[PDB]
């Protein structure tokens, strides 16, 4: 319904749909223009078949298909990888164990897509009414069902790095034996001073233990 919207609001909406994060599981719009499939397939993050065949093996990490000419082609899927803005690029699967595949048919979804169709958000029940002033100046009131049912939530992956260098005084060491700290702080570190995979971490916690070799001592 673009022809009903104002040109300024159309500008804002078009420039603002690019900021929509991909959610946990996405659903394609209940009402929306039919170009969404073409706008999702032409973007290359959706895994499409290079050749026509039949699915042989399906999993969360890969899809192995046997094409009709006889070759065996495996598509790997990026699961919980970091995009340039911090959002995940997790790719769901929509094909079954043994269904037929044609060329260009969508095998696996991408971030913010459902069934190969673009899905930038969720469809929610809406009522227009002033409600006790909490939707004032176009603010948002919403149910807790969008919190408990995991509707509007997103995985955010942040990368953060450090390097142990060779400065003038000596070589920086990645070590567990951090000085002037209690034992419980460094409890979750590895033998070489690395936080373990899947270790829940909070602000101020030790991620990787790097010590500078020495400083002018007075």
């Amino acid at each position: 319904f673009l022809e009903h919207d104002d040109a300024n609001r159309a500008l804002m909406g078009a420039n603002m749909m690019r900021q929509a994060v991909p959610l946990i599981k996405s659903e394609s719009p209940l009402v929306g223009t039919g170009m969404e499939y073409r706008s999702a397939a032409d973007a290359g993050d959706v895994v499409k078949a290079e050749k026509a065949g039949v699915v042989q093996e399906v999993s969360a990490d890969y899809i192995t298909t046997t094409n009709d000419d006889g070759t065996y082609i495996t598509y790997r899927l990026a699961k919980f990888s970091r995009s340039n803005q911090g959002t995940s690029v997790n790719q769901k699967v929509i094909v079954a164990e043994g269904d037929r595949i044609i060329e260009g048919q969508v095998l696996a979804d991408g971030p913010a897509t459902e069934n190969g169709e673009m899905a930038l958000g969720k469809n929610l029940l809406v009522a227009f009414m002033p409600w006790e002033g909490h939707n004032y100046e176009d603010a948002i009131i919403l149910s807790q069902r969008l919190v408990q049912d995991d509707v509007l939530s997103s995985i955010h992956i942040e990368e953060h790095e450090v390097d142990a260098r060779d400065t003038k005084l000596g070589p920086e060491e990645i070590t567990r034996d951090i000085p002037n700290v209690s034992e419980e702080v460094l409890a979750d570190l590895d033998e070489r001073g690395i936080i373990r995979i899947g270790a829940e971490v909070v602000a101020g916690d030790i991620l990787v233990g790097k010590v500078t070799p020495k400083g002018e001592t007075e």
């Binding site: 673009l2 609001r9 909406g13 603002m16 170009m35 227009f128 948002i140 149910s143 807790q144």
Partner: protein
Amino acid sequence: AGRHGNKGVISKINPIEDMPFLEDGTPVDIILNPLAVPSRMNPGQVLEIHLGWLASRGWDVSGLAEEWAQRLQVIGADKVEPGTNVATPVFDGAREDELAGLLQHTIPNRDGERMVLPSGKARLFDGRSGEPFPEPISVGYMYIL
């Protein structure tokens, strides 16, 4: 934000029992100010919402012998199951008569009664006080980003 330039920060995540709810106990998921839309001059979101509702509970149009009904029959949008996605191209969308007539002929949900009036608004209760709101409140499904 929606797709029509409407945006806003979240001021309160209400409990489910505090949201206004429909005639079947279905709470609404998001409350929007109707003050914004006539000043922003983007009524299309409202249009979207009506068709969103029409795509939630499907419609049965056959033999109605009306202009919009015959257009939907020759197009193919005459028998639509509930929940199925609908498509309005960006300048060949569903016309006013089609939305009005489909809101007339929305499939019932329970007790053989349909829940949104042909005006596009539904009688909506209060989750806090419990007394029903005086005038019908426009409800439907908007795709929120």
